[PDB]
Each structure stands twice: as structure tokens, then as C-alpha cells.
Design a protein around this nucleic acid. Structure first.
Ligand code: MG
Ligand code: MG
Length: 59
RNA sequence: GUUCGCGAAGUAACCCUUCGUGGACAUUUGGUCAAUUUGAAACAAUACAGAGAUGAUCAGCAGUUCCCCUGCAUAAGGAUGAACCGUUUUACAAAGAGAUUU
């Protein structure tokens, strides 16, 4: 039987569906810092991004 | 080189030369910069696509940015010039209940 809730359950179920040396580490680091410094040069605010980027440098 | 002397020598006679000699005049340019590759413009060609809020096709104005280009520009253009679309955990406590230990 067809109702709107069963349509939206169908839509929800539809849309729901190796560092080995130091140079690979430096590339991972350079790429991630370009990411975070980009999203912080654009939005100077948003302290949560600052805490995540600081936790990244802790890791 | 010029000029004022001061001596000698040639003719001298008060001039004119050769020569030595004291003074005067005139007195510090240019480089931030070496002459083809190795101290720094850049575009353009072959290949792929064929422009944002869309169900489709479009008008735009902004904003933020350690991106700028054309412009005489504080005007206006550059796809509304473009990038924007991701990753997301703790100022962490109170009352009650069920098991372990003392
Ligand atoms: Mg714009
Ligand atoms: Mg504009």
C-alpha cells in the first residue's frame, strides 16, 4: 500500500546507499594543512575548526 | 698653455729671440646599473569538457578571501570574475534503578 511516509522511507533508503615511509607522511601532512588553512583563511571564525586542526597537529 | 717679473746668452741698446727661474690663473668625472644559457614576464598548440541558485533555461546585485586581470579610475567589466559546497564528540553534570567488592 502507498502513502507519503512509505515514499520518503524509500527515498531515505535510496540516498543512504597506508603510510609506509616519511615522504608519504609529509604528503599527507601538506595536503591536510592546505585543507585546514584554506577553511580558516576563508572563515576566520568557527573555533571548532581551530580545535580540530590543533588536534590534527597533536596526532 | 697665458700673464707678471728676475738673470744669462744673439743682434743689442731698452727691442727681440733661446734658455733657466719665483709668483698668478685653472683643481677630483661615473656606477643602486658588466656583453647569449645558470637569479627568474608570460601566453599560445594537441586532448578533454561546454557556465550558479534547474525538473529546463536564464537576468543579476552583493558578501568573506594571505587570488586577482582589463581599466584614467572611488565608475564599470572579467561565467552573478573565480574560490565558497568539505571535515564535524569532552565548560559533561544531577536524581533514581540492577549486579561486584569492602
Ligand atoms: Mg562575485
Ligand atoms: Mg562584478
Amino acid at each position: 500500500h502507498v502513502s507519503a511516509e512509505q515514499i520518503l522511507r524509500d527515498v531515505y533508503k535510496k540516498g543512504q546507499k597506508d603510510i609506509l615511509d616519511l615522504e608519504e607522511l609529509r604528503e599527507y601532512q601538506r595536503r591536510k594543512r592546505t585543507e585546514y588553512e584554506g577553511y580558516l583563511k576563508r572563515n576566520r571564525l568557527d573555533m571548532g575548526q581551530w580545535i580540530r586542526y590543533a588536534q590534527f597537529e597533536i596526532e
